[PDB]
Each structure stands twice: as structure tokens, then as C-alpha cells.
Amino acid sequence: XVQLXXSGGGXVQXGXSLXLSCXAXXXXXXXXXXXWXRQXPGXXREXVXXXXXXXXXXXXXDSXXGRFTXSXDXXXXXXXLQXXXLXXXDXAXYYCXXXXXXXXXXXXXXWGXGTXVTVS
Amino acid sequence: VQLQESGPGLVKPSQSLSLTCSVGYSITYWNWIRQFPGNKLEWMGSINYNPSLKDRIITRDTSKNQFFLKLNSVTTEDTATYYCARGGDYWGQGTSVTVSSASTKGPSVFPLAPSSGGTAALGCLVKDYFPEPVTVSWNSGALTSGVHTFPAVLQSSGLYSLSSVVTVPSSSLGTQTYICNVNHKPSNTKVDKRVEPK
Amino acid sequence: LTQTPAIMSASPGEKVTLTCSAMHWFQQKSGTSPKRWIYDTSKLASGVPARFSGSGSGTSYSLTISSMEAEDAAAYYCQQWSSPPMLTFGAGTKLELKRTVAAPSVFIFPPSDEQLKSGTASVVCLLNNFYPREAKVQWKVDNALQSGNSQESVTEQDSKDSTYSLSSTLTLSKADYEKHKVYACEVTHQGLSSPVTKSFNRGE
């Protein structure tokens, strides 16, 4: 039943910011980690960031550390990825996924449609 | 205040475990506290008992300023690191006690050969030995970078098994020889096992 | 005594709070004796840096670090004394150093001929240098999920790169080993978009 819809992408200049969001439907996202990954046309999906359950903190990939921030709104059943100091190397389709394993092993069974972020 | 534990590190099941603690301060609470392999701490008792163990559990001797622990009818669940302490401010170094029916046995060292990016992994499986510990080096100590020697696991046979692995450049698999040096003193066994790619 | 969280990951500089729900606090680093760290709820023991503090009352107590330091990574146990005379510890909270996400490197090793001559086959799966700690290793023999016939062990957090490593051994009889073809270990981790499978064919 679960569905994920990402939004907030678009064309941005190098060195600016973005606030991508992902809304969850047909199920609550309060008891599960939400993870952002990204993919370039001819490449594979690389991990970007992860927000575990509240008070279980967040974790990030090396390429986005210090520049990106993940957060959650359990009330609105949504996740958010803040992207600052955007470089052109961040141009990709950003997907959001739900980790089905409550023990955070990342059973990524449900994925979103993704949103295109282009930095130029 | 200094406390030191002493006694046997290997006791047979259903036999008796006796440990002595040498104490910088007079005895007129002094506790025995143990920590299981799972890192759970448990207060057993004190002399100037825990209901979970009161039926089989502490004396004292003032001539040498020592107090002693006596635990009878031990099982494999009693394998633990035992500490003596004064209240909670000064702890001893702790002694590891293994409760097992197993007999001394040297290990078999089998290769974990590298096969088909630019990083390859190889190693050695040190299997079916008793008791702890073994030591593993690589190329007589010349290779340390990328080495991971894992904690041993206790198998259902009652014998220990561990692996020691190392990651290297793939281009070095044809030019560099890799030998793991395993030492098990209780059985006086020493193995130099060569790991060749497959 | 129930300690929260079970594992705390903190970057150098964060304010950290470990809660003991129902105070004394002991610090223990791997292999060493526990040391009294914060006694009588808030009193600092000898040698304890000023960044440590204790608070709480009644049914909730807390140990607080103002600014995390690398040397603060350790297990922290809360301990209480009740006068039914009982001295009780908590399960402890591991305070580890947080780093960037690193997916494990997966390798598989078939059994050697030497071990096969003895009637046993050990297949080894290595997960090298990953973070965070949580992962899942699934053994599959000709796509059949294995259960109750494997054992794993994990290294401590590496002092250099702050990663973990895991080794899993699947053990079978030589006969049961020769009854199948494809041996695989499948790894899931939060740094992986899809599970990583490393496999081999017994005859090759």
C-alpha cells in the first residue's frame, strides 16, 4: 500500500540551496528510518543520507557531509533533505526509500519516484 | 587501594571455582562482580549475596589481607570475567574464568585464498582449538596494515574458531608471498600457513 | 535499570545525554575494569574531566557530556543500590565515534581442500570496513536461506577509520556441502541501495 512522493527539485545555481521533501502515504513512517539516495543517468544509486527514528540520529555519505542535512516530521509523515553549498556534481535524480527493518539493516523495499536536481 | 585477583582460569563443569583477591586498606562492603561474554555486569556478593546465586556462593582472611570467592557446581553459563572491588570506587584487574569440559587441542589452520576491483582479500581460518588464546601475525609481523583478526567464536563442539583476514592490492597477488603465523601456547603449536590465490 | 539508547553515535563536539530509566555511573573501555565515573547522581570521580556531569532524580537519571571527545568512546553503566539489599547494574550504553557512512566490502571464501579431507566445509563471508554497525548477512545455498548453521563475530571500532568488520562462517558436513552447487552470502546495509551478493560454484 505504501507510496513515497518526492518533491522540491529543480534548476539551481552553483553554491545555492534546496529543501527537498518526501511525503509518505498509506503507512506511518514514524517507526522506520528514511534514506535519501541519488542517481546520475549512466550510474547507479549511491547513498546520500539516512534519518533513523527520532533520537536515533542521522548519518551521511562522505560526498555530502557538512553540506547536507536530513530531518523528519513524524506528524506530517514526511522526510526532508536540506542541501547547502550545492555543486554541479550534485546533479542527479534524488530518490527516497524506507528501511523496512526496524533494526536499521536497511531492507529498502519501498522507493519513491525521485526528483531531478540540476546544479548549473 | 589496589586489588588483585588470582586463581585458575579453567574449571571443569560441576566442580568448584575458587578465586582469591589480595587487597592498602583494611577490611573492617567488599564485592565480587562478574561480567559475562555479553558484557552484562552482575553483583554476586559482598563480605565486610545475590538471590540469583545465594544457594552456591565468600570468606576472608586477615593475616594476608585477602578475601575469597567460592562458587560450587559451575556450568558453562558461569564463564565470565570476575572482578573484586571495594564498594564501587576501587576495582581489581579482573580474571577470566572459562568453565568447559574440553581438553587442550591445537588448531588447524586453513587458507582463505583470494580469487576473482583493485582490492583483494585473503586470510587464515584457525579452527578447532582449546583453550583461548591464539595469536596471529602476517609475514612475521611485516604486514599489519589492513589486518583484521576477529574475536573467536565458541562452536557447538566446545572448540574455538576464528579468522584473520587482510586486504591487499590485487597486483601484489603474483609478486608478494602471504604467510599467516599462528601460535597456540597451551598446546605448543606453531603454524606458518602460506595463502596462495586460486 | 534500563539504559537509553543502547548505542549512541556522536561526532566530536556534540552534547550527549545517556538516560537511565528505573544513581551511579561507571565507564568501561574494552577489556579493562569498570571505573567509577559519576557517583551520587552528580559527583565527579577522581580524574573525570569537567565535561562530564550527572543529573536526574526519582525514576530518570542522566549522564551528560558537554562536548564529545574521542577518548570518551566507551560503555557506560548505571548502577543502583537498594536497601531488599540488592546491587543492580544496567545493560550499559555504548558511546561510539560517529563517522560518514561506509558500505561494507563483501568477500567470500570457499572451503579449502585440507578441511574437506576431514569431512567439514567452512564457507567464510567477510564484510570489511563498514559504518554504521547495523547490517544483515544471509546465507543462501542454491537460493535456499540458511538458518542455525552459521556463526559470526565483529571487530571493535577501528582506532583509525572508525569502521567495523564482520566475519560469518557457514559450517556444513562434506556430504551436505557436495549436495549443492551455488553458495552465496547476501549483505544488506544502510549504505547499500540493494543487497550485495557474493557467491561461488562448488565445482569451480
Ligand SMILES: CC(=O)N[C@H]1[C@@H](OC[C@H](N)C(=O)O)O[C@H](CO[C@]2(C(=O)O)C[C@H](O)[C@@H](NC(C)=O)[C@H]([C@H](O)[C@H](O)CO)O2)[C@H](O)[C@@H]1O
Ligand atoms: C568518599 C566516597 O567516595 N564516599 C562514597 C562511599 O561512602 C562509603 C561510606 N563512607 C562507608 O564506608 O560506608 O560510598 C557511598 C555509597 O554507599 C553505598 C550506597 O548506599 O550506595 C553503601 C552500600 O552499602 C553499598 N553496597 C554494597 C553492596 O557495597 C553501596 C555500593 O558500594 C555502591 O553503590 C557501589 O557503587 O554504596 C557514597 O557513594 C559515598 O559518596
